[PDB]
Amino acid sequence: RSFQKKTRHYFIAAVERLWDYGMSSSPHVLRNRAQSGSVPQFKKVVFQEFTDGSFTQPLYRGELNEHLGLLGPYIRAEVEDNIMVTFRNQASRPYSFYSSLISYEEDQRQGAEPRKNFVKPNETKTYFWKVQHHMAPTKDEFDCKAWAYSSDVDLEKDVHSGLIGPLLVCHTNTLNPAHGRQVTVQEFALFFTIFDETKSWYFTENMERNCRAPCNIQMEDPTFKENYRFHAINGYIMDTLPGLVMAQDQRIRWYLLSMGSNENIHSIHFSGHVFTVRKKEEYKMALYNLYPGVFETVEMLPSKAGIWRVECLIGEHLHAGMSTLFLVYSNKCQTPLGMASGHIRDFQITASGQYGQWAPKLARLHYSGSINAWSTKEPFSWIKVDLLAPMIIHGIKTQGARQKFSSLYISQFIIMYSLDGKKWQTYRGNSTGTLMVFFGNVDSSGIKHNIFNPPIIARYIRLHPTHYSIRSTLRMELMGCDLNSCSMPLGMESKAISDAQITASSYFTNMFATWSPSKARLHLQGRSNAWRPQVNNPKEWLQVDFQKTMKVTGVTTQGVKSLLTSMYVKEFLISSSQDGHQWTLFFQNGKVKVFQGNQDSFTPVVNSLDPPLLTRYLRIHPQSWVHQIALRMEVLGCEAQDLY
Amino acid sequence: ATRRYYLGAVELSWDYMQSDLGELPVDARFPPRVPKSFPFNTSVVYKKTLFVEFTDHLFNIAKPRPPWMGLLGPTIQAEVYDTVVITLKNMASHPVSLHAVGVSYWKASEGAEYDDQTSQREKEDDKVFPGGSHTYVWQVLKENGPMASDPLCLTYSYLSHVDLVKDLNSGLIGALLVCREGSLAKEKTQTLHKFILLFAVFDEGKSWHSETKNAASARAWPKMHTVNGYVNRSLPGLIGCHRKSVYWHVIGMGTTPEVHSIFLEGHTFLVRNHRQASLEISPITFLTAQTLLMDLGQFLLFCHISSHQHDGMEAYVKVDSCPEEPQFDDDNSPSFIQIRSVAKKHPKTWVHYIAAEEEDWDYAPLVLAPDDRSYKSQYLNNGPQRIGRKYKKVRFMAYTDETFKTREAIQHESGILGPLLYGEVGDTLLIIFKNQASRPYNIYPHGITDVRPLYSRRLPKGVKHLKDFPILPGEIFKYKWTVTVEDGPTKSDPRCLTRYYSSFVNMERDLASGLIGPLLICYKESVDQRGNQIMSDKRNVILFSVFDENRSWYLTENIQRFLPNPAGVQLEDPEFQASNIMHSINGYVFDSLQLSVCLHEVAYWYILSIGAQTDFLSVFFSGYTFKHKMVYEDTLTLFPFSGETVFMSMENPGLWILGCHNSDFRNRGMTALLKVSSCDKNTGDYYEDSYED
Ligand SMILES: *[C@@H]1O[C@H](CO)[C@@H](O[C@@H]2O[C@H](CO)[C@@H](O[C@@H]3O[C@H](CO[C@H]4O[C@H](CO[C@H]5O[C@H](CO)[C@@H](O)[C@H](O)[C@@H]5O)[C@@H](O)[C@H](O)[C@@H]4O)[C@@H](O)[C@H](O[C@@H]4O[C@H](CO)[C@@H](O)[C@H](O)[C@@H]4O[C@H]4O[C@H](CO)[C@@H](O)[C@H](O)[C@@H]4O)[C@@H]3O)[C@H](O)[C@H]2NC(C)=O)[C@H](O)[C@H]1NC(C)=O
Ligand SMILES: *[C@@H]1O[C@H](CO)[C@@H](O[C@@H]2O[C@H](CO)[C@@H](O[C@@H]3O[C@H](CO[C@H]4O[C@H](CO)[C@@H](O)[C@H](O)[C@@H]4O)[C@@H](O)[C@H](O)[C@@H]3O)[C@H](O)[C@H]2NC(C)=O)[C@H](O)[C@H]1NC(C)=O
Ligand SMILES: *[C@@H]1O[C@H](CO)[C@@H](O[C@@H]2O[C@H](CO)[C@@H](O)[C@H](O)[C@H]2NC(C)=O)[C@H](O)[C@H]1NC(C)=O
Ligand SMILES: [Ca+2]
Ligand SMILES: [Ca+2]
Ligand SMILES: [Ca+2]
Ligand SMILES: [Cu+2]
Ligand SMILES: [Cu+2]
Structure with a gap:
């Protein structure tokens, strides 16, 4: 039975x-x-x-x-x-x-x-x-x-x-x-309203913190009237509302059960976003005046990402709270944060113990005898990271290392995050549980590519080995895509950019050698793989007829290493243009910004860009070479309006 | 193409001007009067700034563009796909932006200044400044079109989001429309009926400078109520045809819960696909609609409510001969031979020997409680300066013996209300009505249109429309209510829209x-029902109301009796005033009725509200609480805009003790509530056909 x-x-x-x-x-x-x-x-x-x-x-x-x-x-x-x-x-x-x-x-x-x-x-x-x-x-x-x-x-x-x-x-x-x-799609319920208090709990409540502030007439009437009035959805006056992890391109459905007194007829708006609704058909709208006591659900969709808002367009109750941003992402990027490649500097890290030179300064393939990873011991260990800022994380990867004979890994960890350390969340996820119990590996070179999604956000990410083989330890390179869903490759490497769009000055060609820019992309290899000017001057330039304009979040650089004499590029500058006739140097904090990069060639390095440039054409000039002036590269950006 | 618009913001001053009339079109005009300068008995004016015209840059400054507008920021119509472009020049002092509301963006448009990780040149046009003219961009998305179920054109607008409040109130908004593909096709060649109303509450007394201490600048004081920016009957433009109809584009706006309703002293409106005639409009909505315009002349399109009239909102709309381009008791019920089922179609006219007399009424008979009970008692129980309980008023009766018949008698399961009256479409009504009270009153129906006192379409020698006048001193008059289809239910609406009638000795007061x-009002012709003798079927009616005896012509005749002291009593203060304002809810207060609804008793409630203004929440909370169907099924809900209405299917499979939801502040424990039953047994019918009668 x-x-x-x-x-x-x-x-x-x-x-x-x-x-x-x-x-x-x-x-x-x-x-x-x-x-x-x-x-x-x-x-x-x-x-x-x-x-x-x-x-x-x-x-x-x-x-x-x-x-x-x-x-x-x-x-x-x-x-x-x-x-x-x-x-x-x-x-x-x-x-x-x-x-x-x-x-x-x-x-x-x-x-x-x-x-x-x-x-x-x-x-x-x-x-x-x-x-x-x-x-x-x-x-x-x-x-x-x-x-x-x-x-x-x-x-x-x-x-x-x-x-x-x-x-x-x-x-x-x-x-x-x-x-x-x-x-099948995502569900969110936003309860709009106007809290008045007083006409509420009672005694103690209305009795926390007392006295009289600047410019008062009396109490129980002219007192801090609209002060005890909360104007908010789910009660988050001002853009305070939390959980709005979107999902660019995933049909969505909102439940806007309003209600309240008799003033709460908040005509809701979804910052630049339409949608549909039903009541015996596909009637469509872009506003909804939830009447106190209504309920109606609605079905919209985010075409693009970034952060937006929602608020009772009723000037007053709005310009008094009631409004929130719903951070949407672009599931199409999940770019690596670069814990293998330099970028994330040893600087950022920490755990609770080095337990023998094994430590935070090591993680993900780093190979070197037996000092190539982090490790710990019996204690309820834990490791944290600081992205230097907040970002979205589609997920992480994990590994292990063997010491002489016996091998070391981890089998199950729990993740915690936040945006200041002060706060701390013991990440759940989809599957039941008061927390999300994940899964490790079981040997060196595991690679348990997990994947939050429910994707997470924060600046700080911790990892707490719940189980391990003889000795806890690991490597990694967790990846995300960041705030306004950007920072992802653009042609160049993916070869998704005609080597006819990349023009440039000096292009030394030879009877074997042939360094035409057409061969100047990250990781790339082959015959005469990279770029070398006619002759190494302290100016020069490489061009990218981007064609369609763009938003650039940064650039990655390199340098070949040919025949017993490799060569990179230390210092350099970047231009910008709206065609091949006008340029605008990229100044910073003051005049020009001498970009520092490359200390070798067997690796790639990247420059930020505090103020994201954005043009349909990009030029670049190096300064402090090495042996010669070679360069292989790719950029970084995310689409945005064009034909203008 | 993909058309590009150029917008401005010239800081001009507003009129709310007079004259109206017309202007004499095509070759030789002359706007009315021109009596020179001095005091034209003055017309107060305020100074604002509204988006504009211009073909490139120019200077300009003055009055309004296309008469029926001027104010209303430039209208932007557009097809689907073909992207639009703008470029606002802040030729003003206000730094104002431009929003969009209802389309595609890129952060390069949602004019805002909040924490939107993006930095300048993303928040650049997301807020301009004086003299500075910045360009805008956004597209028409497929995900933005109509719904093959939606009219071809969605009422949408825009404005400067840099703080709505101290903005809107000066003129920050225009019209934005989107419609099915190749549409510049038939609008660019036919419908000069592209009109767009704009009900607004410009609080010009919040947007420019401050002071308060009761001679060059410009501002005076407080509130407004307008349309497209005009008032007191004014506002030029607005003209429709005869045989053809029109299409309305509305846009709420008031920057505050302040609502505003609006009928048409001349019609019924079409939204979704429901007759509603009332444009139940909220503080900021985008409701579209239309109007099969029969008749001709001019009708007072206006805001019907409380104190929104003298404050404007009223605006005439004309029509004209348009051109033409063609190519102890009980024991009776007879019987003979059944003709199987018996068809026999078409309509028939209803009869109603009804009249209106006086009588004292009370909202009892329930529990009492002096001293303490300072709520459920300031009313039902009278005092030294209180009378409550019972008052002497006048209703409508079907009368059982006047000189002209009867057919009445009644249960309290339908309060002071008037003996209900069905109305099949096409059907016609004969309401032989006669006074029988002190002061002459009238009786008109609010839902029909063809109301001429049969035998002749004339009128009491001198007069205009029976409402405004035809009072009857203790006389007796014969009425004819004919019913077109315009007067009734579409398809999308459940057949049987609620409605009502009453006096118009003035246009309101008596009522109270x-x-x-x-x-x-309904329609059908498939398989009907009925009953026999003193047994009905559609007696499910309810209507809440604010009856302020403090305004009933019988306050004295009431007082001098029920009141101790003769007339020594006080004049009028918030004191007893509100203590003589009983709330009907079908005229009964706190409790009564409890109704007779059974188990599975498929119900059909016809409900509405009256008295004083304010939207209303209302529901069923009992041995099931209960739901219903205003198309979709709905919760603790029912939002009727007062002096307005809608019915509702309430399949009753619940139980007993129904707190009848008024769900509104004082109203709740002030008086309303009510209850519902849950019976059993007694029923008949017949196998496969009709027979029981
Ligand atoms: C954590 O929680 C999250 C959510 O809380 C869970 O993630 C969600 O998982 C489900 C899978 O169960 C995902 O839903 C999938 O949706 C796709 C749709 O892809 C198409 O459409 C995308 C845009 O949607 C529109 O088009 C749809 C057309 O299919 C339409 O319904 C919809 O209304 C929209 O208009 C677009 O981005 C894509 O490019 C693509 O065009 C669907 O394909 C998925 O699987 C279907 O499965 C059946 C049966 O197996 C197939 O027959 C269909 O063809 C689909 O393809 C899949 O199966 C084939 C074989 O049959 C297989 O080869 C192929 O790879 C597919 O797997 C599925 O329904 C939803 O999107 C996720 N939410 C997120 C984050 O986006 C997690 O499960 C949970 N666990 C974790 C990981 O933590
Ligand atoms: C639109 O139409 C409205 C229709 O009423 C116009 O209202 C009129 O507004 C004018 C001024 O704008 C008022 O003029 C004053 O009237 C008073 C008489 O009433 C007042 O005084 C009594 C005294 O007890 C007081 O109880 C009332 O509340 C009033 O305050 C005169 O004494 C003054 O000298 C002055 O003439 C009209 O009274 C008022 N009409 C009414 C309602 O009687 C409105 O101004 C128009 N506005 C537009 C849109 O053009
Ligand atoms: C009866 O109600 C009381 C409170 O009215 C309950 O008291 C709480 O009990 C829990 C444990 O069961 C404590 O953690 C709380 O601190 C108590 N609240 C206080 C301070 O009153 C009680 O549990 C209930 N049941 C009975 C009869 O014990
Ligand atoms: Ca912008
Ligand atoms: Ca912004
Ligand atoms: Ca009246
Ligand atoms: Cu509001
Ligand atoms: Cu109004």
């Missing part, structure tokens, strides 16, 4: 918490007199989920639910089956769970509403209905509905101090059978 | 007192 025919249970409760925002404050007494300092905190209450052991274990979540705002948990559920919502109190005022679909409630001289009203705190209770169709998605798509839940004790008083739930549904064969819900 | 009723 063991099969299955549809049903879903969800563990959830209503706890209280602390609420604020901000990310820019003032020092102990950086102004000995008096200025800022404070931090408006609040005692609201939302919905949490787990298993049964109340607190300790395992009231927990996080990850793709970052954006969850105060909001309870995404209580999904296909159709026809049954919603099992077990609920436990966890605070003052006996609140109560509820949704318009608490339907199919027995009846028999009782009261399915005059009785199930409120539940005294401490005490717990469950609700459990059937997924009738007279409440769900229709033949006219938009695969999942958008219902809603919140307490029906006072009806509002509740609602204000947080405590709000987005119950959606979908239809039959639609949601990742077992462990998961949908994914 | 008590005169009101529903008036459905």
Whole structure:
């Protein structure tokens, strides 16, 4: 006796918490007199989920639910089956769970509403209905509905101090059978509104931090009126909203269940982005005036990346918060951060122990007898990295090294990240668990190419060996693609750029030798592979009839190493033009910027570009050669408007 | 091509000017009057700055472009694909930008200044400055087109996003449209009916300089309410044809929750594919629509609400002869021989020996509670300067014995409302109506169009439209309500749009007192139903309302009775005022009705609201809470724009005790709530056909 025919249970409760925002404050007494300092905190209450052991274990979540705002948990559920919502109190005022679909409630001289009203705190209770169709998605798509839940004790008083739930549904064969819900596309719920407080929790809440600020008339009316008014989606006044990891070119669906008082009719906008909707057809829009209590879901799509926003175009409630940026990426790049190639300098790193010269300054193929990697010991080790800034990470790679006979690797690690060390996230991911347990290798040269996606962001990435072979240790070159989805190869190496587009000055040709620019690309090899001018002057130049304009995030350089006398290029300059007649040197912090690069030839090196140049034509001139003036190379950029 | 526009921002001053009329077109004009300079009894003016025209650079400065506009920033129509280009020259003091809202960008367009990792020359045109003229760019995307289900042209606009607030209010916006491929094809040769309304709330008293301490500059004080930028009936342009229709392009705007509704003293509007006539419009929306324009003359397109009228928003729209280019009781029910099923099509006219008399009404009979209960008691229980509970008002009755018939009697399961009245399309109504009250009142239907007192299309000697006048002193008048299709349901709408009627002795006031009723409208011809004797079928009606007795012609006749002291009572203060403002919700307050809905009782609720203004949330919360279908099925929801309406299918498979959602601040525990039942047993029908009657 063991099969299955549809049903879903969800563990959830209503706890209280602390609420604020901000990310820019003032020092102990950086102004000995008096200025800022404070931090408006609040005692609201939302919905949490787990298993049964109340607190300790395992009231927990996080990850793709970052954006969850105060909001309870995404209580999904296909159709026809049954919603099992077990609920436990966890605070003052006996609140109560509820949704318009608490339907199919027995009846028999009782009261399915005059009785199930409120539940005294401490005490717990469950609700459990059937997924009738007279409440769900229709033949006219938009695969999942958008219902809603919140307490029906006072009806509002509740609602204000947080405590709000987005119950959606979908239809039959639609949601990742077992462990998961949908994914065919991505789902996000943004609850717009206007929090007023006072008309909310009560006592202590409205009593945290007291006195009277600059230019006051009275209290309980002319006091800090619109101050206690939070204008935000999921409660993130000002562009504070978290979890919006997009996905350029992946159909998306938003659930915008608004609600509030009678002013909350926020006409939402999606910073440069249209979309569709249904109500018996493909009616399309670019705005939506969620009426307090509405719900409607919508289906859009990001054609391009970068960071954008969303906000109640109602000048006021906007110019007062309510607005957020949704960082979208270009799954098409996942370029290596360069932990093998120089770039990432030994500088950036750290762990907790060198455990024998084996250390952070070593990682990924670096070969040298037996001092070619990092290593550790028994302790609950850990290694961290600092990209020098924040970036997106499509994933990492991993290896090992053998010491004499016996070999060393790792078998399972957990990843932690953040953007200042101060904060720290124990990365979950798709698969269940209070954390994402990954998988190592099992020998030197493993290469367990894992892959966050849910892609991650931060500046700092840590790795914590949970299991290993005799001795923890590793190498790596984790890769990402960065903030505004850029930094990826452009022709040159991929040979995706006609060697007729690369013109240039001196092009010494010979009876064997033939260094025509046509052969001047990174890693490239072959006969007379690289570029060499007629004769090595301190000026010269190489051209790239880019054709279509472009946004350049930087350039990589090299140098061949021919017949017992290799040669690179140390110093140099770069131009820029809008055709082969006008040029604009790249000055920096002041006059020209002497670009420093190459200390050898058996490797490539790259220059940043604080202020990204962007032209349909690029020239380059070297300065401090070596033996001669050879050069092989490629650039770095990401498409952008043209024919203008 | 892929057409390129050149926009400016010339800081000019606004008129809101008078005259209106016409102007005499093609070869020899003369805009009206020209009486010289001195005080033209003055016309206040403010100074703003709005996007503009220009073919390259030029100087210019003055009045409006194409009469019906001027203000409204330059309209930008476009096909799909063929990309558009701009180039704004900030010939103004405001640094303002230009947005887009509804298309492709590149960061080279979303005029903003927020944390968007990108740096200058990405945030360059994302915010210009004085004298500086910067160029703009964006494309028309396939992902941006219509929906083969959407009209051919989407109402969209733009503006300078550098802080909406202290911007918009000066004139930062224009019209933006996108439509199905090769479209410069038929617009460039036929439809001179490319008109675009622009309902706006210019708060010109927020955008230019400050002071406040009650002689060269320019500003005065506060609020506005306009359209395309005009007011008090003014605003030139706006002219449609006869047999042909028109297409409306609207654009909300007010930089604040301040809403604004709007009918057409002359029509019904077409959005989606639903008759709605009201343009339920929000603080910033892009609603398109149209109008099969029968009739002729001029109609007061205007904002219908509260204090938005004298403040403007009203604007005339004319029509004209267009050219033509062709190539204890109960026991009765008879019976004889059944003719199987019996067809017999076409319409028939309804009869209604109905009238309107006086009577005192009360919103009881429920629990009491003095002193303490300072809420659920300031009303139902009277005091030294309170009367509540019962007031003397006047409704509509079907009357059972006047000199001209009857056919009535009624349950309380439908309050003060007026005896409902179906209306099949084509069908016609005969409402033999007669006063029987003190002050003469009237009765007109708000949803129909052909309302001429049968026998003759004339009018009480001197007069214009029965509404505004034809009061009846205790007289008796015969009415005829004929029903075209224009007056009723499309396809996309569930057949049976709710509606209503009432007096127009003035155009509103009487009402409050008590005169009101529903008036459905529907259509079909497949297989109907009915009943017999005192048994109906479509009695599912509900309507919430704000009845301010403080305005009913019977405040004195009411008071001098129910009030202790004669008339010693106070004049009028927030005190008792609000203590004499009971809230109907079908005229009953807090609790009553509880209705008779059964189990699986497939329901069909016809609902609406009246009284005072303010959108409204409203729902069912019972032994199922309940959902319904306004096309799609919907949650704790129902947002009717007051003095407006929509019905709703409510298949009832729920239960009992239905908190009937008013879901709105004070309104909730002030009075509304209500409940619903959950019966069982009693039913009949017949196997395969019709028979029970
Ligand atoms: C972590 O979580 C994330 C999400 O939370 C999970 O990642 C997601 O995984 C699913 C796979 O289960 C991915 O969905 C895939 O979608 C592609 C669509 O590719 C086409 O279209 C792309 C744009 O979408 C449009 O076009 C679609 C047309 O197919 C249309 O439906 C849609 O509405 C859009 O309009 C475009 O970028 C592509 O270039 C391409 O044109 C689909 O192909 C995937 O697989 C299908 O599978 C069936 C059956 O196997 C095949 O018959 C189809 O042809 C598809 O191809 C696949 O199968 C063939 C063999 O059958 C195989 O050879 C081929 O390689 C394909 O695998 C799939 O449905 C979704 O995109 C991911 N989300 C992300 C991040 O993008 C992770 O699973 C989870 N785990 C991890 C890794 O952490
Ligand atoms: C559009 O039409 C509106 C229709 O009313 C115009 O309103 C008129 O506005 C003018 C000034 O703009 C008012 O003129 C003043 O009227 C008062 C009389 O009423 C006032 O005083 C009483 C005294 O108790 C007070 O209770 C009222 O609230 C008023 O404040 C005179 O005493 C003044 O001398 C002055 O003439 C008109 O009264 C007002 N009409 C009304 C409503 O009676 C509006 O100005 C027009 N604007 C546009 C768009 O052109
Ligand atoms: C009854 O309710 C009380 C609170 O009203 C609960 O008390 C909490 O108990 C948990 C452990 O079960 C503690 O972690 C909290 O600190 C307690 N809250 C406080 C300070 O009151 C109690 O658990 C409930 N059950 C009973 C009867 O013990
Ligand atoms: Ca720009
Ligand atoms: Ca910007
Ligand atoms: Ca009236
Ligand atoms: Cu707002
Ligand atoms: Cu209005």
